């Protein structure tokens, strides 16, 4: 799909492996403030990917795109980086 091509283009996903440990915004004592910083981090990324879209409506479009055969092969690349 042309609308789901934003994930295929590899512009958003390489920033999810580079910007996530970069912020280091983690506190073990707090659950709410840490998850609020996490939600604000993804809300920023979703607005840059495609603006003028509802937050809840955007998240559901990402998971539906993930089920695709082309996307599944690309996702299996990220899990291999963990293995020694």
């Amino acid at each position: 799909k042309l609308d789901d091509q934003r994930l295929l283009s590899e512009k958003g996903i390489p920033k999810l492996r580079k910007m996530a440990p970069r912020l280091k915004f983690k506190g073990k004592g707090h659950e709410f403030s840490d998850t609020a910083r996490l939600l604000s981090f993804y809300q920023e990324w979703l607005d840059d990917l495609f603006p003028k879209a509802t937050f809840l409506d955007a998240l559901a479009m990402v998971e539906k795109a993930g089920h695709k055969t082309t996307v599944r092969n690309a996702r299996l690349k990220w899990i291999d980086e963990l293995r020694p």
Partner: protein
Amino acid sequence: HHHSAGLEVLFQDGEVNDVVHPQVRAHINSLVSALGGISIDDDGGYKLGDDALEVLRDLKKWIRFYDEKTNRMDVARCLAEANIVSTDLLHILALWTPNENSNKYKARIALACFELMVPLTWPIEKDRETMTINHHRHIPVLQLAQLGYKRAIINYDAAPILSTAVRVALPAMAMPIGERTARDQGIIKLILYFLRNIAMITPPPSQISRSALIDAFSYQDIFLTLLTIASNMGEDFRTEDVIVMEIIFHLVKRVDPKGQQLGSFVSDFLDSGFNPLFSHIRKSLEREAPHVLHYHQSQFFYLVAWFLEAERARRSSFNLIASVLTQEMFIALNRALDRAYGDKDWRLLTSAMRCFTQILLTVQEMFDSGNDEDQEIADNILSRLFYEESTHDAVANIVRTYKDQGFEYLDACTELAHTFLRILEAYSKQDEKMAEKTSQERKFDFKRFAARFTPQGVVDTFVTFTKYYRDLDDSQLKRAHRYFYRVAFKQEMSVMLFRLDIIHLFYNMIKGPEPLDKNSPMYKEWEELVRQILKRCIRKLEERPALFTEILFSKINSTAYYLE
């Protein structure tokens, strides 16, 4: 503006045409006037018409041969505007007093009133092939007219109409089933359908109309009549089993099974007319009877579920509901579950799932019951249920596959999924080497069974149910709480629960736009729950950096095990 506007006057009667056939309106009005009228003399009463019996028979002919045969609704609308079922027919039935039941003429005119009242108060279904442009025009008026009929019948000061209805069928009800003719069996059907019709009438989408119905039913001894037909469902009765069931179904409509207004009836019904009535309906559905209809199947499952909850509010004897706990019922509902899913019938499945939930809640209360025979039967039912994989794989697939099926269906499947896990968990626990081999083997089988509720499909269905937290009650919140609590306490590490959309909901549920009310008893349990899930969420991101990219939830059970 200083002076009045001339357009303030409205529009105006024979000179202006109506939606009905102009000659029908004249003919129907010739009949409604000829049947009688109120006496001009003070305390005179109601003057019955001279040819009242024949005009009533002529009005019945106008319904069957003009409205029904030609697919029209003109005579129906004419009688609605005349409001005879509220202004004329009620006064005629008032004349036939309990001491005057011997009057043949007064009993025949009373029957002719119900032979007219039944088709007029009959429920209408908009979605039909037979329906034309004519039907669709009149239906909104007739539906409102039917509410006006019910109101007048329930609140009639002069005479008890519902008690008068029972008296019409009563002599043909006394004679044996073999001795009853086709005419005599028709009077029982007509009177039973009249009681169902008035109980059916509700405004299309007030609680006083629901209360007044129960109050009129008990006072005019209709609940006593319903009990006598239901308790003798074997001998003297047959076919009427579904008609009586429908009356009680429209009575228990949006009624709580515990601490109700009809508390006097519920105890008497379970003691006399539960097993003979519900065993007959079960046998009627199995043999594929001609009198039974498709909608009667889902109504049956609703009433079984309703009366099982009503039984646990009293729990005088768990033997009074023995007919619905038989293995014959189990085979029947399991075949009904497979058939309803295939035919894509969700309303039938909703009632079947809710019925099955109440059966499982009953066997659990029979396991802790004081009766020695009750614990014996509860354990032999649970023994089969713990190993019957045919039932297991079917229930698990329903909760896994959910898409635009409605909240009523969602509340029914999550009710069954939560109870099935909870009841089997109790069985999973309860010379030394021989006894342990058979006792500890059930713990292996339960972890295999609980693994059916772990996939993404079952998770998402419970997540979408949790979304309605603002409207969910204390018991409804317990189901969602105990499911997610079962995910972390499964050693699963809630890998399935880790998804942006799922994490979003849990946060704003406690701290966000909808605070779920801090004073609620379920809030404190949920606040402790969400914090425990989010604690493992932050920890798993540090443990594995792949979780940041695999937060999509599009994963399966094999990739989730890699993460934990």
